[PDB]
Amino acid sequence: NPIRDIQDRLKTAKFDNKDDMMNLASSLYKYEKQLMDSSEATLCQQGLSNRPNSFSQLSQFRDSDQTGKFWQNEYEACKNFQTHKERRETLEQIIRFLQNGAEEKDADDLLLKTLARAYFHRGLLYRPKGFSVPARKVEAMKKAIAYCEIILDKNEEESEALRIWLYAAMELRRCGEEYPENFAEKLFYLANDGFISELYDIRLFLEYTEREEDNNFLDMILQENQDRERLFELCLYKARACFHLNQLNDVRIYGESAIDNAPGAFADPFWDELVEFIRMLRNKKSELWKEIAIKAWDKCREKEMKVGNNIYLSWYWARQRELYDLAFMAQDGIEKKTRIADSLKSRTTLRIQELNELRKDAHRKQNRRLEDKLDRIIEQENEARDGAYLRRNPPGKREEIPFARLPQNWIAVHFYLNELESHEGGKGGHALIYDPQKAEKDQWQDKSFDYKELHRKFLEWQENYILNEEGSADFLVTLCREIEKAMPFLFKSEVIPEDRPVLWIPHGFLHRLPLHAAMKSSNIEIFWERHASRYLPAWHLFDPAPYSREESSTLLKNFEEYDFQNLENGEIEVYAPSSPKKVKEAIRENPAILLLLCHGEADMTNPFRSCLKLKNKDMTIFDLLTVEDVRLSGSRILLGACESDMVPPLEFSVDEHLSVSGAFLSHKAGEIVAGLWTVDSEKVDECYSYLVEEKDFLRNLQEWQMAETENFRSENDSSLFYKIAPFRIIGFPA
Amino acid sequence: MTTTMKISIEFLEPFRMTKWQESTRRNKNNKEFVRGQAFARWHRNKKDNTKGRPYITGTLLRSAVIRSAENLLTLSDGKISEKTCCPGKFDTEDKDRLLQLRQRSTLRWTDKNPCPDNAETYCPFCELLGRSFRIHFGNLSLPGKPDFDGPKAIGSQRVLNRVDFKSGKAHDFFKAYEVDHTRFPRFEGEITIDNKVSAEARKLLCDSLKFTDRLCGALCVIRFDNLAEKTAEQIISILDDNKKTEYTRLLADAIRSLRRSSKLVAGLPKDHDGKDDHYLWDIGVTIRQILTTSADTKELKNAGKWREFCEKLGEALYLKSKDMSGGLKITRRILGDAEFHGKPDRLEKSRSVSIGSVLKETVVCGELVAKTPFFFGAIDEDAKQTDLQVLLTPDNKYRLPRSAVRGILRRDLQTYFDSPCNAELGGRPCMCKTCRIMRGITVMDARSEYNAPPEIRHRTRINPFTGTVAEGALFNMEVAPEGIVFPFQLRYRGSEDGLPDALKTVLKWWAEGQAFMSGAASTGKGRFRMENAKYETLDLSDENQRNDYLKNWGWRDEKGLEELKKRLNSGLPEPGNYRDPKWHEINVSIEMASPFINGDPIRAAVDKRGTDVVTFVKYKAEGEEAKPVCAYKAESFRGVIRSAVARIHMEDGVPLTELTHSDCECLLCQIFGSEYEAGKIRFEDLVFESDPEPVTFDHVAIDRFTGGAADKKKFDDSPLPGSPARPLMLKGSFWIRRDVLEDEEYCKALGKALADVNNGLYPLGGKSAIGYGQVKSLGIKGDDKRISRLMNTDVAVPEKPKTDAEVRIEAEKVYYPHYFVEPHKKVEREEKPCGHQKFHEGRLTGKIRCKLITKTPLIVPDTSNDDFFRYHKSYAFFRLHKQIMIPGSELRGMVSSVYETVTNSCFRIFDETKRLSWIPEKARIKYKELLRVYNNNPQISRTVDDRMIGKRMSADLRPCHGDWVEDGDLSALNAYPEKRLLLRHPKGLCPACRLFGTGSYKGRVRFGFASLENDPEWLIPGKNPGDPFHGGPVMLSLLERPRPTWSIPGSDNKFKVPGRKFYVHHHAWKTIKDGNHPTTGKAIEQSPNNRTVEALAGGNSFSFEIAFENLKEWELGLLIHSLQLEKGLAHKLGMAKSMGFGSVEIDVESVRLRKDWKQWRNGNSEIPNWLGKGFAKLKEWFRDELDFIENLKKLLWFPEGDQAPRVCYPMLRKKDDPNGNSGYEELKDGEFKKEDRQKKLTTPWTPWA
RNA sequence: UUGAUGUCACGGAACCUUUGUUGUCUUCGACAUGGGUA
Ligand SMILES: [Zn+2]
Ligand SMILES: [Zn+2]
Ligand SMILES: [Zn+2]
Ligand SMILES: [Zn+2]
């Protein structure tokens, strides 16, 4: 016990020796800290034996009389725990106890260094909240730099103080904040001092040599051992040094080694360092960044979580888009570029808070098979933050569908928006077409365009539509004209031959545009007059199947504002009181034709929380995904206004969101029909009545579009064209 | 040539200002400079010092005028008088030269392209823009241009945070200055025109100037036409000279609390006697005299001067006292700096939208009434005495910040829509429902007439293991009172027909009384209610209405608001789609049948009454006055409920009371919140359903050796009285979220905790060891029977066994009143006692029902009034609400003495410092203490002992946590924490201290009050034959202190303490009933030295309660034995035990045990087992050395019939007795020699004559 | 003390976590004085 230890130390005390005084002070401070925190040791209710001698010794010791050594030892005791929570709480305690002692004017170098290191570690341990770095982290690094600066005001060549200062400066540079003052001068004072054999100073030495053109340390850097646990850091630093030494073959070999041996979580700084290295090599005109970027993308694409069929999940990384921009430009083959572009579509990326929320929902829904994997991902991401500082390194694929599966009477069109290329002043857009009835070598084409004006017009139309609803038909017309003017190759008849339906696979904001309704500049012709159209969220969802066999229909409606004449008083069965129970029964019934005319509400933070508004209940899309014994193979679905209702406003041009279309695609639904924006009730009634009256859906949609576009063109009515426009088909049955 | 135009702007609210920066930093890459662009500016006369004045630039006014002109043009469909207006130009080829660009969407009213770049004429809008200087906007400055020392001379800096919605905690903030409009209400400038501007352009400029409604973050109207240091030094010097340095913090707190009024100085408390000899205010001149003259001085006569004087003294004393510590210095305010500014992007796309020609403004007016205390955090860095502080204006008035009101509106709108907004600072505006609604809302800043000082509450933290307050856990918080009324105003400019449905629903929620608007909402702070609401709609699309609005400036000054309020209509619209609130109210009713107390040392020291402990009282704002009322703290209630919830739940085998709860996700954290989250339940203060005044109860500590009152602080408390016949009713409510009410697990946990609290296991308030705060029942309402569902054999007890004590009583000899019981020389100590953090397995928790029956006249005087029957004093039997009672402290002490003697524990209460009596440091101190013996006594020299009385007994038998008796002074180690270890025993706690507790450990037994169960039977008939509830008087003989020198004759080392004093049972009260003396037989005469009392007779019956928790089988066996001793033994209780008064007997009748949280069992069929286990434990400790047990049984042997022993003290000499008995003078040189005295006094029942 | 064809800062709640608790019968009999004596 603390009292027993104090008694033992007091028994053998020498007033001229030092070690006795340090031990006695350490025991007293330990007892006082144990008194500070309400631990279980407070139940001890004894005193000290030999009262006169003990009192005399205590009085003499207090009259004669380190804090810094004790708190240092506490710090190294903290620096080898297994749990980040334990490390964090211990660091909080250490900082809280050291504040006043350091604030005292006559503070010592050991005390100030300990506090600075504690601040640096706590700043490193901070967690993310949203789209930007926390401010507490930056303030912690600033505090560490302030402590090092006050130490360096008095003393000049403190190795550890200079190292901590440089670590804080480099981490600030890694964050959005720019460098501090005198950074080059300090980096020059430490370069002059000497050479340390540490992974976490090799970065500083690499920066110094790359800045001041001094390759003296590269020999020592390259001649390091290979008996460590973070071998990828050695491989990357050796590759950089060899590149400074022009030993390009060695650079390459270290490149494949580093890419082959890499960690899982993206919180490790290794991935950011790799991306920075690739960008530097590209800027320096060395033609091996292409192969390095290709291999890095190939390694990186396999990190994802499978929830539900045809749906995948991932954790957010800032530079993934940039890396996928660097790999796309590196690739030369058109088919490989198409694969790289398709690697991003139909994928959901979430943050720590969203992952925790979905884990809680799964726990409430009793899904161990998913909860365990979520906990593994969360704890891995949490633990992989300070692995570089603490010298630790804790430890699938999917099949590819050949492009030859397309029929002989179809054309496939892919899209991809290269943000980095657009920022470089070039044409960021890319249209990648494919043609089955041509020579094997000449079966692919690459077309480029600019999308800045199109994005501006889309934003203007979206703002107007949100503000005044129907008072934006002219803006929609302008948007369609902009689409046609920005992609003129659709109307040349040599790239896309006549009588050949097209299959659109958009990427980014192009999902929410009517590409099938492009207007060519009073003679005006519409795109749909020449070819039909289909849509797919991604190419890897391609899986043709036949239709159903039994004949039946079902209607699920929660719309009291409008009564659908033909739909209700017709051939299909009517269920006005549509509850979640009856909805589940309908999905499990496997009908031939299904309709769902209800409302919805979006969710901008968690995509899985978007709700369908039913009678006295709200059914999230996640609940739709997690339904047992679902039978919908080879069945058509007509949907309603909910799909257009639960779409959040777009913010970034390369953003994507999941909806009921994807939810029903996960159930292998034969087809889906839905609108892009708020549809009209009477037009919905007429169109769906025609669609259920006939069998084929593509022919129905084409004939209906021609029938009503005749009436439109008879008078040039933008308000009517606004009603004709929002209609499309998703899926590809047999 | 040009023409000038004077301009003046008058703010209706405080406006924000930015800090000075160097010209090098004044660029577009500086985030702070870019952020501080819409505020005012500070100009320095010279850049060395901060002397200067503020100003406003003309560019901001130009931008505001342009925005107003655009709004007017879209309202008017692009026409001024006869000329159409082009949409203007906002495109620049060289963007790098522009410090700031436009992010909002420009308004659209026409389809024509802008004018040509080079043209001979321009539209009025283009002329106003300046595409041809046409219009020049000057700088706005104060009239006369005065100079101030710095920015802090006109305003103060305030922190403004951003609160996360999902969690409920802020992670970043920013700072800005604030200047009050009362002192700095107006600025003036000029506008110059080039004498060629069209009349249409001038009309548009005038209309835009009138339409501009706010600037610099405030609403505006634009028209065109030193004894404290000395006193602190004196007080500190006096305290240092008198060595009373430990009371500095308490003195500072008292002096600070005196700021309420100067009349409190005249009514400072006094000592018990009534003279000016207080332990705090008369340390010295004296502190009382210093404060008196300070209040007397003419310059401090003023109230504000007195207030600032008291605050300065408190701060100075606090800073002086802070440095006296000698250990680790912890800091609780840490790791909060998260300053962050928005970053407006420069690559933003340019957009244009058409909102339409329809526009309506809806005005809403009312009040905001504070139903509970509120707390708006605003901590000043210079004032360090108080931890948490509130926001006040420069004239010391409460404030209701627009920032807080707007944030609460945004939170409520998000709650209604059920869709959090994840927008980030910078970029184009967000386009969600909440942001769209909030973009058109305007709110005002209010203040109150009430300007009294704030009231401050203290808070602590309880150690779950030892049961006492945690070490170094004390902090205080300022709280504003309840009942303050703030004016309320709200304007919504939008295109919708009336207000939105979401706003209507939120306003209805506020009207119903769910405006949780302030901080500290967990402890029930800041609930408001909207009342006297009025509203109207104004259609600005109409030409005449728009012209009237522009002419009257929209009625924002008071002179227009007066007419607008006349035009207003009473009521509020009902919503179309109403959604229920997120919180539900639960009512609480508590019934208490015992006294109650909630300590507050600051009020105890400040109040005129000299009581040590007082109850908590809070003030209510009645207009511009205050009204104290007694209540129970919401913090204390929350702590009790949380402990009850935690102590019965476990996580992976670990009780929740042991976990750190830092970054935790346990049931307790999810329900009650944590540092990283917000709680889901809010507690409010409870108020009694009456206005009962406090009473006064006084106590005393009895020395175990002398038998008199130890020289301790005679203490008293002021609880609120209660009785079984007149219980205390306590009422209140707490709020619970709907999700918690839906969660079955949380409902079950809360129900279990409430059931345990209702069963009577968790007392409320302090001093519960003596029966204070016993909850009789508890119930709740308004939960739809979801939590109250869980809030829902008698064999004859064995009789006592016959005693074995045998004593021979002759009928010729006279005996002595008291004898000593010599204890064993072995005490069984233990270092670690049982913990309070859970209900340990294998231990028993339950209740005991006792039954006390009187056998001899009992006296328990009521000392509130010392002249009941008419110098000569008089007293009456203890009564409370006209009901005869016995306090629980008397029974606790009576049982504790016998338990200590049985278990052979330490002397629990003892006077170690007393020194008896009959160059080096030893000689002088003996001389200094000798003069006080001569100079103070009611009645060759003394033989002063060289050692204190504490050294005259075995070290094992001294108190465990005692005083310092060894040579040397511990005053050196006052600051250092190791002082306590030099006072405690090296081996731990004895069995008595384990059960009844000590100063650093909580006990495990609680004693309740006792009630008489029948009509009283008085010893003497009363004055009124028709009043059987009052008795007559009886005159007792003289009573005097004991003399310890009788049991310790000489100073030789062979004399030691003999043991514990005990009194015998006899029938000498018969002579006291008559007028005869006990021993001389003469008549007792009235004198101012003796007393008169009211006494009961035999046969009366009482009954009381004992509660215990975590007791082993052997511990409970000995406790029951100490109550029901034997058949033929009796206790002693009350006053005048030496004369025979006050022999009682206890009889146990029922024992009930606790099995789990719901099921209780009758434990009457296990008393023989516990008694057997108790005796076995004594055998192993003492095999056959059990002689103190039988000596105790001899002294407690009650005489039977056919026996009448004669017991009385001897007289001094043989010349003063009619009976011819021996005397003290001849007994000393007789059988009672010095070398044989101790042997005689140790044998029970031995005669002296 | 501003600079001009471009300022949503009424674009941001100082927010979140801690029982003034613990220990005490309003109790009661031996002297007091300096020398006395020599
Ligand atoms: Zn113009
Ligand atoms: Zn928003
Ligand atoms: Zn917890
Ligand atoms: Zn003890």
Side-chain angles (χ1 to χ4, degrees), chain A residues 604, chain B residues 410 421 423 430-432 435:
Chain A
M604 311 181 327
Chain B
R410 188 181 278 278
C421 179
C430 188
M431 197 65 72
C432 73
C435 287

Side-chain angles (χ1 to χ4, degrees), chain B residues 43 62 89 91-92 139 161 168 170 427 443 460 520 522 636 638 674-675 677 698 707 767 816 890 908 939 942 998 1040 1043 1045 1136-1137 1209 1228:
Chain B
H43 157 77
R62 182 181 175 269
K89 200 185 178 185
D91 197 297
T92 314
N139 277 350
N161 66 348
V443 190
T460 62
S522 288
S636 313
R638 188 188 215 223
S674 61
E675 182 65 26
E677 269 278 327
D698 64 83
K767 289 174 152 284
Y816 190 76
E890 291 255 12
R908 184 176 177 87
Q939 296 183 359
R942 295 287 191 278
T998 178
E1040 62 278 4
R1043 302 288 289 278
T1045 52
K1137 295 187 275 272
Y1209 286 114
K1228 287 175 188 292

Side-chain angles (χ1 to χ4, degrees), chain B residues 108-125:
Chain B
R108 202 154 170 280
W109 61 82
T110 177
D111 299 327
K112 316 195 175 191
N113 290 342
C115 297
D117 288 11
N118 294 343
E120 289 77 12
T121 179
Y122 286 88
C123 46
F125 188 53

Side-chain angles (χ1 to χ4, degrees), chain A residues 686-704:
Chain A
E686 293 181 25
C687 183
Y688 290 3
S689 288
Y690 196 63
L691 290 173
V692 302
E693 171 48 52
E694 280 86 4
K695 297 293 104 177
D696 190 1
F697 274 5
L698 202 73
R699 183 177 292 171
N700 285 1
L701 183 63
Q702 215 187 4
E703 290 171 8
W704 194 74

